[PDB]
Amino acid sequence: APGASIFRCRQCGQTISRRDWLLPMGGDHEHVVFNPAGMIFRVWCFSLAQGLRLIGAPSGEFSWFKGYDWTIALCGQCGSHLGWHYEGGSQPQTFFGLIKDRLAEGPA
Numbered sequence: 108a109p110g111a112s113i114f115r116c117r118q119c120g121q122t123i124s125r126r127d128w129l130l131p132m133g134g135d136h137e138h139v140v141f142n143p144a145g146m147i148f149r150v151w152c153f154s155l156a157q158g159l160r161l162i163g164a165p166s167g168e169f170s171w172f173k174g175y176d177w178t179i180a181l182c183g184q185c186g187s188h189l190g191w192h193y194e195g196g197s198q199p200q201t202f203f204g205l206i207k208d209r210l211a212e213g214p215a
């Protein structure tokens with residue numbers, strides 16, 4: 108009965124990811140970043156996620172992760188901005204960067 112195994116959308120409960128899918132990009136699954144508007148995000152990298160809607164076409168503008176282009180990732184149920192999908196890079200080609208405090212962790 109593990110209580111710390113799946114991540115859901117904090118706003119609505121949509122299933123998003125799993126602790127097992129955390130990905131240590133450059134040696135750490137956690138990355139702290141800012142956007143051009145100065146908003147700070149504590150980003151958890153995941154190899155895999157579900158339940159999202161990836162919006163529009165990829166962009167390399169202001170990418171936090173060298174060699175990757177991003178798309179906004181919304182909660183596919185409620186529209187909450189949960190993070191970004193990264194693509195176009197190498198080892199891995201793709202991953203998800205999700206905002207830790209916009210997820211809730213709990214049992215499967």
Ligand SMILES: O=C1CC[C@H](N2C(=O)c3ccccc3C2=O)C(=O)N1
Pocket residue numbers: 141142143144168169170171172177191
């Ligand atoms: O890797 C990324 C993901 C997108 C992120 N980003 C934002 O969070 C944002 C908000 C408003 C205008 C432009 C941006 C932007 O590039 C950013 O700064 N880097």
Ligand SMILES: [Zn+2]
Pocket residue numbers: 116117118119120121182183184185186187
């Ligand atoms: Zn949601």
